[PDB]
């Protein structure tokens, strides 16, 4: 209640900025895969971009959405340059680590973790 906006008055232009950022990432994925000799395909990278947007897609605060857009623009900028390397852009896929299972039987069989 009665906070100061940073870019967006409400959620609509925040979603507009989100759509602009998503367009930029979607266009940049093929150039990234071509330039950095990535094992993945263009479809996998665009699906990963959609996955990141979806895992951030539950927040309804305009300031938080604007800050996520700003951080996404920074990440996109260092992907536009080759500041990020193959290792940095393949860290999004978690190809090495085994995911912890979501079921109580497995989480009971190994570890005392909830």
């Amino acid at each position: 209640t009665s906070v100061k906006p940073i870019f967006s008055r409400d959620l609509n232009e925040a979603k507009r900025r989100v759509r602009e950022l998503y367009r930029a990432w979607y266009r940049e994925v093929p150039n990234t895969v071509h330039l950095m000799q990535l094992d993945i395909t263009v479809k996998q990278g665009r699906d990963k971009v959609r996955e990141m947007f979806m895992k951030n897609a539950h927040v309804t605060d305009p300031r938080v959405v604007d800050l996520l857009v700003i951080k996404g623009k920074m990440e996109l900028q260092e992907t536009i340059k080759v500041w990020k390397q193959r290792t940095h852009v393949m860290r999004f896929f978690h190809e090495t680590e085994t995911p912890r299972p979501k079921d109580f039987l497995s989480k009971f069989y190994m570890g005392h973790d909830p």
Binding site: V3, K4, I6, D61, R63, V64, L67, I70, M74, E75, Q77, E78, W83, K84, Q85, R86, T87, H88, V89, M90, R91, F92, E95, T96, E97
Partner: protein, 207 residues
Amino acid sequence: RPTVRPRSDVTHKQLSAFGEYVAEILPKYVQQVQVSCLDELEICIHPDGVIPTLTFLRDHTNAQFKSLADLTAVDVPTRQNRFEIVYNLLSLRFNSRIRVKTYADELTPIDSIVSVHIAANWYEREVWDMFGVFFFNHPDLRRILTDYGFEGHPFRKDFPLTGYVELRYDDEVKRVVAEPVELAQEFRKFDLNSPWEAFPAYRQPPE
């Protein structure tokens, strides 16, 4: 007393007079003016007056603080605005130092002072990288000290000392990969706080 420092009440009085001067010149922004017993002048202002306060201190005739020494942030995660942004300024003309404080939270950015001092470019990049305080109108605001894909702002109090991820070479993928952190030692925190107070001058009143 050969083990105690001298006091210099003359420069304490000078800094007090200059604090009155700045506080009455800029009443719109100045919230507090204090002079420590170490003879350092601190001026705590509203975040809206960062640009006018820093411009006044950069080029006012009686307050030429044209050199910016330091720009840092302090995370105090118990106040409502958890970041205290601190500017240490140097006056070569009058051979003085001033400190200007403002506040921020995770969702309230502060106007950058790159138009006033150019060192504020990298200093505000470091503040954003280490604390997540965004800066308005900053040219190429981005990370400066963390890794390229690093997530989170590590100088915050709630960030762990060891971080959340660690890097190792993996021969299957032939890469340097990131894993969740698993220490073989588990850094031992030490409770090095005496249960007896040491300084009665700072004894807070009870709640």
